[PDB]
């Protein structure tokens, strides 16, 4: 029961490790799967994509990690783009805060979400072989989900791994929504495949893996353009482009996406003198997606990623431990239209971004108190020159482990993305024109958080209180007057604070009852007044029940009270306001050749009109009542 993302273990009390067997019974998308963990919401976008929203932050203010590596996707661009991780094929998903975030990115203020996978075995399987098989169906979805993974000892110290998943799902049923049985364009198909090969220790393991993922899914709530769009708008010619928006007023939207991945991992256990561990990670990621209407492409998306990170763990110099590393990340990306680059300027013109990053964490241990500090300094070059310095310092006081009090502080700098300073074009799915800013200054943030945790047979609880102070908070500022939005990229200050927590009391070791909840406030302060921050979540209180009876069978009930959101940003609207009731049960079973984990799930029994203010489809109801039956065969 540990975490893997940091070569050196810095553990704060508000760290959460979700089990992989459990994820097999969860939604396919990352954001839907993590929703329900206190402090984490979702930005759904039909059955296709959903991003986690963590402490009101999302995208570039958090970090999704594909087994310590850059996923290489383009989900940071907009929540309609799927995140390239397979949580249903994952070993574990760890949600981490602290100085560790500095190992992977700059500007990560809310949480690091690392998805660890079986791609490259790291260990020799028993009996020479191991793997699992999974199958499930879901009502009103209409989800079919099959999955498998395999590990084979190709000899004495050699292991091959394969794994894959195929999913088909329809437009989802909606309660009371218009006169519709199902919400149009919310269907989703996905396949993933991996082949791996890895060594064994001592000292460690080395290995490579090839992956392939094709996604095909609709764009819910959704011909003339080649001129007027450009050129051009700085400044006020939105006057002249939504005049011919009602001229053509008076295809079928979907995304076809392909992701190809080549990576290498290695990590052995006593590299040479003075060091306890050495860890490498090489990655190449081919990402593409066409945003289409029928068979025609409206936007071409591309993101080539190459990523390298080397981390070594130094000798404990007398109870102070540390891991220092270097990372190289180059990312070639573009976002084009059917229109040539010879007539119009692309939404995102073809660009070359390079990240040179030096990082590390150091922890000192004075018995029942740990102190870990962290740093990151990355330089960027941007062919078509700044530096981000981020630091974090954190203390943990164990009165009696486990009785945890964490105090964590950090200053993080995020360098602006090329999208943010150079965007200039209609993104169809979002029906928004995007404009960049030639002069943004880095996102600087000063963050403080205190977490408290106890888990002691009778009582179990987890609490966290946080504030995030931005001297600079870069945001997509909606602009001057169901047409098409226009956003400019802007700067101000911001003040985010909130709380999240869960507490469980078990009367017997047999039964467990619990209450959970979260709340977050987001404000824009000091504008070039004092308005709310965009797409902030809503408060949520949770009631939880879970009980085994017995040895194999495990029923469970989850009731969430999602309150409305009336603290809204510049052009936002109110969002109710729903009651989520979820039922669940599980079958544990031991036959020959495998453990057989049957499962049955019932979500949204009250059949409520569910809206999420934190999503781009805030006035679009999400899935009504749905039944799920599934099987897993571990072996
Ligand atoms: C036990 C059920 C497992 C089913 C696994 C499905 C098989 C995995 O599919 C992987 C291939 O997915 C399609 C890849 O296509 C990529 C397109 O690249 C061609 C471009 O020239
Ligand atoms: C820190 C909570 C556990 C009990 C602390 C008392 C023991 C020593 O703590 C004093 C200094 O460290 C406290 C935590 O440090 C936070 C780092 O903030 C640095 C901001 O510049
Ligand atoms: Zn898009």
Numbering used by the authors: 20 to 241, 248 to 259, 272 to 287, 300 to 433, 457 to 553, 564 to 610, 628 to 734
The authors write:
The high affinity of this TbdR for zinc is exemplified by the observation of a zinc ion bound to ZnuD despite no exogenous zinc addition during the purification. The metal ion captured within the high-affinity binding site is coordinated by four conserved residues (Asp-99, His-100, Glu-340 and His-499) located in a buried pocket that is sealed by the plug-apical loop and extracellular loop 6. The nature of the endogenous substrate bound to ZnuD in the crystal structures has been further characterized by X-ray absorption spectroscopy to confirm that the bound metal is a zinc ion. These two dynamic states of the external loop 3 illustrate how this loop adopts various conformations that would ultimately interfere with the surface/sequence availability of this epitope.
The zinc-uptake protein ZnuD is expressed under zinc-limiting conditions and was originally discovered in Neisseria meningitidis, where its expression is under the control of a zinc-sensing transcriptional factor, Zur14. ZnuD is an 82 kDa outer-membrane protein predicted to be a member of the TonB-dependent receptor (TbdR) family, requiring the mechanical energy derived from the TonB/ExbB/ExbD inner-membrane complex to couple nutrient uptake to the proton gradient across the inner-membrane. Characteristic of other TbdR family members, ZnuD consists of an amino-terminal plug domain (residues 1 to 147) obstructing the lumen of its own carboxy-terminal pore-forming domain (residues 148 to 734). Combined with molecular dynamic (MD) simulations, our structural findings suggest that ZnuD acquires free zinc ions using a series of binding sites that move zinc across the outer-membrane through a transient pore that requires TonB activation.
